[PDB]
Structures are given as structure tokens and as C-alpha cells.
Amino acid sequence: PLGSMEDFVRQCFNPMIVELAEKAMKEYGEDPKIETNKFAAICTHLEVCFMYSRFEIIEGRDRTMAWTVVNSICNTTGVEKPKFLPDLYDYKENRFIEIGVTRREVHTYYLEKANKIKSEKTHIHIFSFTGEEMATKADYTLDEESRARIKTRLFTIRQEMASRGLWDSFRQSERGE
Ligand SMILES: Nc1ncnc2c1ncn2[C@@H]1O[C@H](COP(=O)(O)O)[C@@H](O)[C@H]1O
Ligand SMILES: [Mg+2]
Numbered sequence: 001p002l003g004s005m006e007d008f009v010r011q012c013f014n015p016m017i018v019e020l021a022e023k024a025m026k027e028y029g030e031d032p033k034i035e036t037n038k039f040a041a042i043c044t045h046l047e048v049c050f051m052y053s054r055f056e057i058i059e060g061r062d063r064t065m066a067w068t069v070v071n072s073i074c075n076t077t078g079v080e081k082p083k084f085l086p087d088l089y090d091y092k093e094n095r096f097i098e099i100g101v102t103r104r105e106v107h108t109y110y111l112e113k114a115n116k117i118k119s120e121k122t123h124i125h126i127f128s129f130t131g132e133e134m135a136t137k138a139d140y141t142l143d144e145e146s147r148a149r150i151k152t153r154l155f156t157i158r159q160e161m162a163s164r165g166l167w168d169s170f171r172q173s174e175r176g177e
């Protein structure tokens with residue numbers, strides 16, 4: 001009763017999500033059949049981006065199209081150009097957003113992300129599988145039920161992993177970037 005994380009991924013995520021995630025892994029020479037906890041994390045983070053998004057999706061795009069979209073927004077608006085390539089753009093609050101989904105402590109992950117991107121303008125919003133969240137300046141952007149729907153989906157993933165004996169490994173395998 002330990003299942004295959006690959007089979008879980010292909011069965012419990014939307015195929016559009018799985019295909020984007022495989023595309024993203026193959027781009028970096030990681031194999032979805034091998035690095036399966038990573039495959040699941042990737043799909044989960046994609047699904048959160050899509051649920052969160054008013055918003056232009058950046059994550060999930062081919063890197064040349066993602067930078068085209070970033071540059072196009074930056075040279076249309078005032079906005080500072082990110083050094084990395086965020087997840088979303090918010091046309092309302094006029095800023096890029098980095099979304100994180102973590103199996104570690106949310107403050108730890110948040111500050112890792114803040115330290116990587118070194119931006120005063122890009123908003124960071126971190127979700128955990130425990131239902132904890134942390135967002136830049138305690139500005140949460142979306143309303144309560146929209147964030148609750150994201151947390152609920154995270155719990156559903158976790159329980160469905162547990163059901164297959166996949167949670168233990170998945171939850172223990174996250175490293176710093
Ligand atoms: N569409 C995607 N393309 C590449 N990596 C992704 C995608 N969705 C999720 N991920 C993974 O989920 C997190 C996304 O990276 P970041 O956008 O820096 O939080 C990292 O764990 C990524 O490797
Ligand atoms: Mg991203």
C-alpha cells in the first residue's frame with residue numbers, strides 16, 4: 001500500500017496541468033518518471049496559480065513567451081522588470097506576484113523567496129498544505145473565500161496523497177531552491 005506518485009499525478013491533476021508540468025521538468029532535464037515528488041509539487045504550484053488568477057498568467061508559459069509577456073507589461077506600465085520571472089501580473093494593484101506552495105514553514109519559504117528575487121515591488125504570496133499563508137505586507141489580494149478554496153484544494157491533494165501512502169515522502173522531500 002505505497003502507490004506510485006507518477007500515477008497519482010496523472011490521475012488527480014487536470015491533464016493541461018500535468019502537460020505543463022512535464023514541459024517545465026523536461027526543460028530542466030528532470031524526468032517526471034523519476035523525480036516524482038518534484039512533479040507533484042510542480043503540478044500543485046501550477047494549479048494554485050491558475051486558481052489564484054484581473055490577472056495575467058506567467059507561470060506555465062514557454063520561457064520565451066513568458067519573458068515577452070513580462071517585457072510587454074513592463075514597457076507598457078511603469079513597472080520594474082523582475083530579475084526572475086514571476087508567476088502572475090495583477091492589472092489592479094499593478095504588480096507582479098510570486099506564488100509559493102510549501103511543505104515547510106511558511107516564513108522560512110517566504111524569506112527564501114524574498115531573498116532570491118530582491119525586489120521591493122514584486123508581491124509574494126505563500127500557501128502551505130496546513131492552511132497557513134503569508135503575503136507581502138499582510139496584503140492578501142484575494143478575498144477570504146477565494147483563499148479558502150485554494151487552501152481546500154491543498155488539503156484535498158494532501159489527503160489523496162495520504163490515501164496512497166505518498167504523503168510521508170512528499171512532505172519530507174522539499175529542499176531550499
Ligand atoms: N508551470 C511551471 N513551470 C515550472 N515549474 C513549476 C511550474 N508550476 C510549478 N512549478 C514548480 O513550483 C514552484 C514554481 O516555482 P516558483 O514559481 O519559483 O515558486 C517550483 O517548485 C517549481 O519548480
Ligand atoms: Mg514561477
